[PDB]
Write a protein that binds this ligand. Structure first.
Ligand SMILES: OC[C@H]1O[C@@H](O[C@H]2[C@H](O)[C@H](O)[C@H](O[C@H]3[C@H](O)[C@H](O)[C@H](O[C@H]4[C@H](O)[C@H](O)[C@H](O[C@H]5[C@H](O)[C@H](O)[C@@H](O)O[C@@H]5CO)O[C@@H]4CO)O[C@@H]3CO)O[C@@H]2CO)[C@@H](O)[C@@H](O)[C@@H]1O
Ligand SMILES: [Ca+2]
Length: 144
């Protein structure tokens, strides 16, 4: 069994993760497992992610642990996103939504198309604009 996500538990800090809004830190307060987790700071929409080459016609599971440290207004989303390879490059997003203030695990299943329009991206997107900080850890993307 292989997790496609690089540094999936943030145990190597922010290695392999893009920081899009300069609002990410690998800290112990955000750890669900191991010593570190990802904190996305509250107050503005922010996130990060990584490119993950996926196999065509393949079924995957996407899962993650998350919690906000205070009640949020919006959500924190764990997303696999890519274009289909057709005349339109239709955009598809497989989305997990979190708004819980206790550590919560969520997972989904998806099957990739025969051809990709773009390289799949794993996005950790804290669209919430409340003061709440977001903790995320142990992100899984696994072929089943
Ligand atoms: O900033 C410099 C770097 O930017 C990089 O590009 C980033 C960009 O900055 C931004 O962070 C962007 O963030 C997007 C997320 O990646 C993701 O695609 C997200 O998708 C959202 C939808 O927008 C929408 O909100 C959707 O709502 C759903 C709910 O989730 C739910 O299902 C239900 O309520 O229905 C709703 C729809 O009605 O949720 C999606 C999942 O979160 O949108 C974000 C934009 O707001 O990501 C870019 C990377 O992809 C790079 O360009 C980099 O090079 C720069 O350095
Ligand atoms: Ca961890």
């Amino acid at each position: 069994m292989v997790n496609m996500v690089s540094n999936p538990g943030f145990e190597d800090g922010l290695d392999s993760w893009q920081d899009w809004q300069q609002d990410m830190s690998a800290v112990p307060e955000a750890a669900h497992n191991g010593a570190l987790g990802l904190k996305i700071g509250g107050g503005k929409a922010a996130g990060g992610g990584q490119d993950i080459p996926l196999k065509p016609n393949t079924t995957y599971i996407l899962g993650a642990w998350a919690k906000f440290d205070s009640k949020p207004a919006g959500t924190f989303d764990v997303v696999v996103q890519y274009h289909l390879k057709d005349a339109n490059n239709t955009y598809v997003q497989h989305i997990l939504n979190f708004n819980e203030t206790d550590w919560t695990y969520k997972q989904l299943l998806f099957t990739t198309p025969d051809v990709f329009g773009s390289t799949p991206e794993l996005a950790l997107w804290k669209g919430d604009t409340s003061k709440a900080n977001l903790y995320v850890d142990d992100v899984y993307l696994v072929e089943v």
